[PDB]
Design a protein. Structure first.
Lengths: 366, 367
């Protein structure tokens, strides 16, 4: 008898992420996310995830130097992306890019130096995401160059404009907030690839393969698309009364299968939206719309334990830095790449078992 | 509490493949392998797997026509494959090609025309496989042309040499024989992708990424490699006595999770190899090493319920048709693509659920 969706099945133990949905607490190796965003950066979160402890000043410096040495990608990886249609789905192009890398990285060996490898993949993930954007906007490639931070190099490479401090911060916290959460289908499929001892690019490919589906990718998009549909802050009430109240639909970006309280990263994402809305007028138009909705939603649903989740405001942040709605999932993927690599290493390094489930034959035997 | 490897977990129910590991019975939709390799083609197996029954004579002819209309692949996919290193692993190159096709295919919708779409994918996989081979040997790309069969089409594309009945037959039976078997990491990864409703080319990319691990792909290559190590039939006993007997090595091509008898499709694989080794003097030499090694092996491990499995002979058929050792898992992938499509289709149309397993958080409460 089928264990439907694997819902009640534990695929692995993890030392990586802990979520308390009663309280609304998210931790990475024991540290609350709020401490990480309040005092740290993406770089220190990478170190934590991969190596287990907070890095020394010299240990963090060393990570940062590896990252600076690894943004480059063989030209063939950029050429392939540019052979695909400009109109192609961002996640589909990420797929091709990661599959290409897989294929060029002949001579990889599990357990030799996994952590360093992962660091070089994070650096190259930045390069593809930047160029996936550029390629869909018709621009020539641009490769992240060394800088004081990973958020800065990525933004530099994307837009070719000197980002403001607030922009560097928004993108850096963004990266930490989405690093890991649960084991959705993208992590599962990565875990499945990795249990056959496949390379890390191939597991990311498989993770990206699952993320392309609409039941996994598009969360931020769909939430964000509500605001566009509203258009004007003055139309929120009629929209909410109609759609929500008496037609009984969902508030996309509300609710959660673990959180019974505000999502800890929705709190942080909103705050970052406030720091960037001054500069983009569309971004500010959607924040006022989104902020009117949230008050209407909390009055309506908090009594049933339904709160704004992380996708209600992360789109406004991304939109406010200049990324088009078609890149939200790919920005999620950039960030989630850290989580996925940690799960894979962790799996293969401490609790390796090939994955071979079973199907039950039904219908006639002869 | 953890279901290590997902071993005793029933991920889905299925009407596709039934295995009896005591009796050695392998059937597809109720039909024994023997009846299909004996009497029909790979095309008939495509129809049965996808539509659920045997094709009436014209049903099979339309499918055939459908295949024939679908070998062409956009030049960008081929350019992509030709942009990677010729020394790349072949599964890797396949992954690139399926990803390239997934992102070019912006017009896809589950539950509209799955079967027709799967048919169109099977044919493009033949082109992919044919051209991953050409690129690794350094030749210009060649696209399968319409013909009386898919095996004929594929061999022509591959070698650009007209194949023979025996050849067309061996390729075509190979395809039926590797179509489906259990739910390994490749099918599982295809299910996980399809559970989010990703596209079919993307689910294949997922399956192909998992297939590349050395713990899933490379089986037929490990069996055949042993024979090459031996070199000549006059050394079998020394090597056998050397490596296996006293040094307790693992005979490769022997052993099974489910079959504790001889693998049914190994039995047919051997026959197919007898059928083409006349032609290939190099094949026969390897076939003679193989046949003598099976003999000692069977003598050594039959009591343990360890008999030759399907990977012990397949390499010889593929080698006899002209494919190098590096194409082996790719040849399997070509075959198993059918099984992958039927499984995700069965899954999305009848048992659709999104996959979200649990992780159990052990690890610092609050550092």
């Amino acid at each position: 008898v089928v264990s439907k969706g694997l819902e009640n099945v534990i695929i692995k133990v993890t030392n990586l992420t802990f979520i308390d949905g009663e309280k609304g607490i998210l931790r990475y190796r024991g540290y609350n996310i709020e401490d990480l965003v309040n005092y740290g950066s993406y770089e220190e979160t990478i170190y934590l995830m991969l190596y287990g402890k907070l890095p020394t000043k010299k240990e963090l410096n060393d990570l940062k130097a590896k990252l600076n040495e690894e943004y480059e990608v063989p030209q063939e990886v950029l050429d392939t992306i540019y052979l695909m249609p400009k109109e192609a789905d961002a996640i589909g192009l990420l797929e091709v890019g990661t599959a290409a890398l897989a294929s060029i990285d002949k001579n990889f060996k599990w357990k030799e130096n996994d952590k360093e490898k992962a660091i070089s993949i994070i650096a190259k993930m930045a390069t593809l995401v930047a160029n996936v954007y550029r390629r869909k906007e018709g621009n020539k490639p641009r490769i992240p160059e060394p800088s004081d931070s990973f958020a800065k190099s990525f933004l530099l490479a994307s837009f070719a404009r000197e980002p403001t401090t607030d922009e560097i911060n928004a993108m850096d916290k963004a990266l930490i907030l989405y690093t890991d959460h649960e084991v959705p289908a993208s992590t599962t499929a990565a875990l499945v690839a990795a249990s056959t001892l496949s390379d890390m690019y191939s597991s990311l490919t498989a993770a990206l393969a699952a993320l392309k589906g609409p039941l996994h990718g598009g969360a931020a998009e769909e939430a964000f698309k509500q605001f566009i549909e509203i258009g004007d802050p003055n139309r929120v009430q009629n929209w909410f009364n109609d759609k929500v109240v008496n037609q009984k639909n969902r508030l996309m970006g509300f609710g959660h299968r673990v959180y019974k309280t505000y999502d800890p990263r929705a709190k942080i994402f909103k705050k970052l939206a406030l720091t960037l809305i001054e500069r983009n007028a569309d971004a500010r138009r959607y924040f006022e719309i989104a902020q009117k909705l949230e008050e209407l939603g909390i009055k309506q649903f908090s009594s049933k334990g339904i709160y704004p989740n992380t996708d209600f405001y992360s789109g406004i942040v991304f939109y406010a830095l200049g990324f088009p709605v078609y890149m939200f999932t790919a920005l999620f993927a950039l960030s989630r790449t850290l989580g996925w690599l940690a799960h894979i290493i962790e799996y293969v390094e401490e609790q390796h078992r090939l994955i071979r489930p079973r199907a039950l034959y039904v219908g006639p035997e002869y």
